[PDB]
Structures are given as structure tokens and as C-alpha cells.
Amino acid sequence: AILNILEFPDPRLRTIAKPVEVVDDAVRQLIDDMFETMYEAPGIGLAATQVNVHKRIVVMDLSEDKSEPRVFINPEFEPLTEEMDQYQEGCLSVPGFYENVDRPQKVRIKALDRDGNPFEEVAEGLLAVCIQHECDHLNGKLFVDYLSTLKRDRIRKKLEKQHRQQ
Ligand SMILES: O=C(C[C@H]1Sc2ccccc2NC1=O)NO
Ligand code: NI
């Protein structure tokens, strides 16, 4: 199923997601719907908060051909260096806008996989950017939160206008 993706400034995007206590079949079915939603948008990552399911679940596929689905349940990360990098980010919940965001350039991810087993993973580049961006969603944070207040308000106003016209 293709789930509806919430869009800024919907307050539901600010909800803090709750950890997943057991990765059962319902969780894997939600994950499958999230990937379908994500691939159809299309986008390279998606957090459950974005589809209004407030659980700590993230899916991603950084390939150009759907050949590398990745699952992160109860993800966390820790910067591995103090160095920062800029990347122009977009978001399915803030469609049509792309702005630079500075974030730690390398982080160590820790999460549960699709079977519920814990693993860790060093991330740099697009992977490090995407994992931080998706974990932010789970804590009710959007990339526009890093922008100047005036730029974020300009974004909000445009989206609000679009939502009224739709
Ligand atoms: O909205 C999304 C999908 C985004 S994640 C992202 C972050 C930095 C640069 C590009 C993207 N692209 C996505 O599709 N995830 O929450
Ligand atoms: Ni996003």
C-alpha cells in the first residue's frame, strides 16, 4: 500500500516516535508499505513519522535501481569526527524545497535490522546525511529547523498556500 506522506507544517511531523519493542510481522508489513511509498514518491529514505506512524522505523534505498533496500529500526548514531559537511537536502515532507544543511560528516549507526538483530555501521557521504535526516524525523525534527527563521517561514507560507489550493 502507498501511504500518505505528511507535509510540513502538519504538527504530526513533530511527534516523537516510540521505539519498536518487537520486530514482528506487522512491523515488517509496515516496512514493506513504507518502501513502496518511498519508491513511488520517489525518495531515497523515509521515516515512519512521515507516514503518521509514530514508531522508530526508517527505510532507505540509496541505489539508482531499487537494488539496495536498507532497514533501520530504533536507529541511533554518534558522530565519529567533529568535522562537518554541507549537503543540499530535500524531504518528501517538505516537497519541492532543497536547502543546505551542515551535519557531522561521518557517524556510526546502531540499529536493529529487519529481523530485530542489532548491528552497527560506519556511514559517510549520502548514507551519513540520510541516516541523520531520518533519525531527526523520529525526534520530530525537519531539515527546515536548521535554516534561518526567515527562510523556514518563506517555505512554510508556500507550502501552506499549496495545501489550500490542493
Ligand atoms: O524525505 C525523506 C526522503 C529524502 S532524504 C534526503 C536527504 C538529503 C538529500 C536528499 C534526500 N532525498 C530524499 O528523498 N526522508 O525523510
Ligand atoms: Ni525527510
Swiss-Prot record:
GO terms for biological process: co-translational protein modification; translation. This is Peptide deformylase. Removes the formyl group from the N-terminal Met of newly synthesized proteins. Requires at least a dipeptide for an efficient rate of reaction. N-terminal L-methionine is a prerequisite for activity but the enzyme has broad specificity at other positions. CDD domains: Pep_deformylase (cd00487). InterPro entries: Peptide_deformylase, Peptide_deformylase_sf. The keyword Iron applies. Its cofactor is Fe(2+). Keywords: Hydrolase, Iron, Metal-binding, Protein biosynthesis. It catalyses: N-terminal N-formyl-L-methionyl-[peptide] + H2O = N-terminal L-methionyl-[peptide] + formate. Belongs to the polypeptide deformylase family. The gene is def. The active site is at 134. Fe cation binds at residues 91, 133, 137. It is an enzyme of class 3 (hydrolase). Pfam families: Pep_deformylase. Binds 1 Fe(2+) ion. It comes from Pseudomonas aeruginosa (strain ATCC 15692 / DSM 22644 / CIP 104116 / JCM 14847 / LMG 12228 / 1C / PRS 101 / PAO1). GO terms for molecular function: metal ion binding; peptide deformylase activity. HAMAP family: Pep_deformylase.
